[PDB]
Design a protein around this ligand. Structure first.
Ligand SMILES: N[C@@H](Cc1c[nH]c[nH+]1)C(=O)O
Length: 332
């Protein structure tokens, strides 16, 4: 019994042997397995729980994007029978060529720029592709707000308040203001019109925009991997998710936001309503919600206090950034 100190299980050899890759060496590396041939050529093998039908549309989506010029993805390798996956032991395995690069550093404008460019290219290249294949962003955030309010009410009535409880209570008025401003933006007719128009025109988002899926290459581009969460969705979702992650880790340095907006805009103009949808998402106090949710619904962990402390440290810089962006959007 090793419990949570159990290593990633090796992919069964029978799966490897369905391919024609003459693999000599295999080892886990993060959430993929690296397969290497006698020349040292590498492949990334993924153990997934996605359905085979889902794997098929995912591949078809990327091949469609490619016929439109898209290059920013790891290329799938097929089995000896031409299948895009192997199904074995209740898992779906798929393999891609290896992409040389490093996980994007979302604190560097250059890396944010290239991630944004790539995400925008993916969205553009997939316009109109299987648009009805499977969205209530207002309801999601409304529920989070209701949760957040309940959580600080719970904290306030504790006999003994710990450092986290007290810190969360100290920011209630700012958190309330931000949540209210966000939900008001989601209720604005222009934001809704944007979201609905995107739903109609299609275009997929990647929807797992984390450094380990955004590989910054020696050719100074970003190549995406892991399209398992990708689906038709408004472009603002990928844009806002990239921005939030970048900005929270670069203390709201607007060079990171500019790098992002410029490179989305280069592929397709950002209209005012798209900016406003992005603002609605960014204005919501997502991190305090998420951290408090974990604490009070799941269990306390000291990392939650670290995270809330960092949010508090950055809170004025975040306010300043969102203020300047709001002004920018009024004089586009
Ligand atoms: N080259 C990536 C790993 C990878 C390539 N393809 C899939 N995963 C890295 O930074 O480690």
């Amino acid at each position: 019994r090793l419990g949570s100190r159990s290593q990633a299980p090796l992919i069964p050899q029978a799966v490897v042997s369905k391919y024609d890759l003459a693999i000599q060496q295999r080892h886990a590396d993060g959430n993929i397995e690296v397969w290497t041939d006698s020349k040292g050529r590498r492949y990334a093998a993924k153990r997934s729980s996605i359905a085979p039908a889902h794997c098929r549309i995912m591949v078809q989506c990327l091949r469609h994007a490619q016929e439109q010029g898209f290059t920013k993805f790891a290329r799938f390798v097929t089995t000896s029978s031409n299948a895009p996956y192997v199904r074995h032991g209740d898992f779906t395995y798929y393999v891609t060529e290896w992409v040389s690069g490093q996980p994007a550093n979302f604190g560097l404008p250059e890396h944010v720029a290239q991630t944004a460019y790539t995400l925008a290219q993916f969205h553009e290249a997939t316009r109109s592709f299987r648009t009805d294949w499977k969205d209530d962003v207002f309801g999601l955030f409304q529920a989070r707000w209701r949760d957040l309010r309940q959580m600080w009410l719970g904290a306030d009535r504790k006999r003994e308040k710990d450092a986290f409880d007290q810190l969360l209570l100290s920011m209630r008025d700012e958190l309330h203001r931000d949540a209210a401003e966000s939900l008001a933006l989601f209720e604005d007719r222009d934001v809704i019109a944007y979201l609905e128009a995107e739903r109609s025109s299609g275009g997929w988002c990647h929807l797992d925009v984390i450094p380990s899926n955004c590989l910054y290459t020696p050719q100074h581009q970003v190549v995406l991997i892991d399209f398992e969460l990708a689906r038709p969705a408004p472009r603002a979702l990928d844009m806002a998710h990239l921005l939030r992650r970048s900005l929270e880790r670069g203390n709201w340095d607007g060079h990171l936001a500019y790098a992002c907006f410029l490179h989305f805009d280069a592929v397709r103009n950002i209209p005012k309503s798209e900016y406003r949808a992005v603002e609605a998402i960014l204005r919501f106090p997502y991190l305090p919600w998420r951290i408090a949710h974990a604490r009070y619904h799941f269990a306390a962990d000291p990392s939650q206090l670290d995270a809330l402390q960092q949010y508090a440290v950055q809170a004025e810089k975040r306010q300043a950034f969102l203020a300047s962006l709001r002004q920018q959007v009024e004089h586009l």
